[PDB]
Structures are given as C-alpha cells and as structure tokens.
Design a protein around this ligand. Structure first.
Ligand SMILES: Nc1ncnc2c1ncn2[C@@H]1O[C@H](CO)[C@@H](O)[C@H]1O
Length: 349
C-alpha cells in the first residue's frame, strides 16, 4: 500500500530551476507578493535586464496561480561568504551617491537619506545590515537643532532606541543621540591632542558634551581637565561616563554644568584650552583668553576663507596682547567646499 500524494510531493531532492519574469515597474510588488505567498526562493539571486526582473521561485504551479509568467533560467546561487568592505559594494551607484556618510556610534548606524532615494530605503537598510551585522539600530539623520545641537534622527530599522555605549581610544562613552550631541569622527583629533598633552597640565574643555575629549585626554595623561556643558542631560551622561571610566583614567575631570560664555570669565586661566566649538559659533576670543600656552580652536570654514580665518586668529592674538604662532589644519571634509578646521595656537613666552 502506497503513500499519500501530499506526503510524496515534498520529497524531490533537486534544486529549483525556474523563476518568474516581471516588468521592472512591477518588481517590488511581485517581490512582496512572492514573499507573502511563501514561494520565494532564498537560495538563488534575482537578476534583471533593462526591461525585466526575474525572481527565483520554489513553486511554479502556485506562481502560475498568481498569474505570473514562469521561465526556466539558471540563476546565480546566493553567496555564502561575504567579502564586501564598504557600503558602495552593496548598492547601485545611483543610490549610494545620494547617501550621506555613514557613522557608527556603538551599535547604532546613522546615515542621511534624501527624500528622492527614500523609496529605496529597504535596500539601503539591507546593505547596512550586511556591512555591519553587529549594529542593532539604523537611524536616518537630519540636521542639528536647538542650542544643544541635537541631531534630528528617526529609527528606520531595529531596536527603537538612540542610546548606546561607544568605544573609543580606550574609553567608554555612554551616549543618547536623542538627547545629546556627539561626533565619533573626532576620534583622531581627540587622540592627537591627548598625545600632545604633557603630564601636569591644567586643561579646559568648553562645549564638552558627554565629555569624550576630557575622557580621552585624562585616559592618556595625568592632568586636570575642566569640562563645561550647558545641556543637563549631556552633563548627566558625562557624570555617568566619568564614573564608568574612573579606574582607567590617569587624569582628573571636573564637570561644570553651565553656559560657557558665563562660566569661563569666572574661571582661572589654563595651560591648554580645547574648544570643540558648536558650528557657526564664535568663541575664539573667550577661549583664547583662558589659554596660557596652547589653544586648539575648532571651526567650520569655507575653502576660500581659510587664509582670512588664520588672519582673524592672529588679529585676536594681537588684540589680547599675546605673541603667538598660529597653525591651521584641515580636520575633515564637512560638505562641499567647506572644511572642519582646527587653529593650533602656541602662545609664546
Ligand atoms: N553656551 C554653551 N555653553 C555650554 N555648552 C554649550 C553651549 N552652546 C552649546 N553647547 C554644547 O556644546 C556641545 C557641542 O555643540 C553640545 O553638547 C552643546 O549643548
């Protein structure tokens, strides 16, 4: 006596060799459809030409019951190994070129996605998820808003949170991107100055945020750092960060919750001042006034204004009766024709 047909029908060992041929304009719809009905073959790649897309299917009868055109095609197997090293490898150039720079903060990936390629959201996420399998949050970014310069962010994939712990230069940085400002790309800078700093210095860091700069400096050198931040949530996270990194800091950090322009005139002077100035803000005079040996003044300057920028720094140096050497460095490419720069000011004796 024999087997039931509805038991036999699943015994075939061969691979699926067919697919469905659809117009490109239908391709997303159909993909969804195939996934929903449950006949989408994950083992094979989809291919396309200039007019049509072909999706691999696991049941051609059901495919025909969906009114789709069944074709016999040898489709590429899915890759098992992964050799992509950057996002451009995982996206068409027309999509990738409109994307902003991708940033990783802890287990959060942040990318800017213009409205015109927003329909392609799902491939973008996919690519990101493929490049960074460890991240658990993908958020679309806008601009910085308000006095605290908090980045506009919308979670578009993963856990519905914008808080995490970021590892940098040997320190741990608790961050909440919905409540505080933070830029990971300053890593280099923060390390650099940390290496320049000598033991015994008194250092001032205005606009300190969740104190990544004081944390790195104090991580590598036995110094005292004053940090000034006006955002109380950032202050809170800064305290938690100070407590989190306490047993790995050589230096000391004093956190001051307040307005830089109010606090600094009531502070004593320092050996070194490090000013991660908010974009558009001019704190040159005030930060220089608190520096006795070195100022590191960050700013955003247009390509054709660098010279003028340097000149103005020198002017301020003369204005405060200081004799200085001024060096201007391009820290990063901020947007076209616009650089994030740093004025290294050596105050001479
Ligand atoms: N007058 C200010 N005083 C102290 N911190 C400030 C001031 N303006 C901006 N910030 C902080 O500087 C950081 C970088 O812009 C942010 O955390 C922001 O809240």
């Amino acid at each position: 006596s024999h087997h039931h047909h509805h038991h036999l029908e699943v015994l075939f060992q061969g691979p699926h060799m067919s697919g469905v041929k659809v117009r490109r304009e239908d391709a997303k719809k159909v993909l969804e459809l195939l996934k929903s009905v449950g006949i989408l073959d994950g083992k094979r790649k989809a291919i396309r030409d200039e007019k049509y897309v072909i999706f691999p299917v696991t049941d051609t009868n059901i495919a025909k019951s969906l009114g789709l055109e069944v074709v016999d095609v040898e489709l590429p197997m899915r890759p098992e190994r992964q050799i992509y090293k950057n996002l451009e490898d995982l996206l068409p150039r027309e999509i990738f070129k409109k994307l902003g720079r991708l940033d990783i903060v802890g287990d959060i990936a942040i990318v800017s996605i213009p409205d015109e390629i927003l329909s392609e959201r799902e491939v973008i996420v996919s690519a990101i998820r493929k490049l960074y399998p460890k991240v658990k949050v993908i958020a679309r970014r806008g601009f910085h808003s308000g006095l605290y310069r908090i980045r506009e962010l919308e979670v578009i994939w993963g856990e519905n949170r914008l808080h995490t712990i970021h590892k940098e230069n040997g320190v741990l940085i608790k961050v909440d991107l919905s409540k505080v400002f933070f830029n990971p790309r300053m890593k280099g800078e923060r390390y650099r100055i940390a290496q320049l700093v000598n033991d015994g210095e008194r250092i001032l860091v205005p606009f300190a945020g969740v104190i990544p700069y004081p944390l790195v400096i104090a991580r590598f050198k036995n110094v005292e750092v004053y940090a000034v931040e006006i955002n109380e949530f950032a202050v809170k996270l800064a305290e938690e960060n100070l407590e989190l990194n306490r047993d790995r800091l050589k230096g000391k950090i004093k956190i001051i919750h307040g307005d830089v322009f109010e606090v600094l005139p009531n502070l004593p002077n320092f050996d070194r001042v490090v000013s991660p100035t908010p974009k558009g803000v001019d704190a040159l005079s005030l930060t220089l006034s608190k520096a006795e040996k070195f100022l590191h003044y960050y700013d955003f300057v247009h390509e054709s204004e660098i010279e003028r920028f340097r000149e103005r720094v020198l002017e301020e140096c003369r204005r405060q009766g200081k004799e200085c050497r001024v060096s201007v460095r391009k820290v990063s490419d901020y947007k076209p024709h616009v650089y994030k720069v740093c004025a290294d000011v050596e105050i001479l004796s």
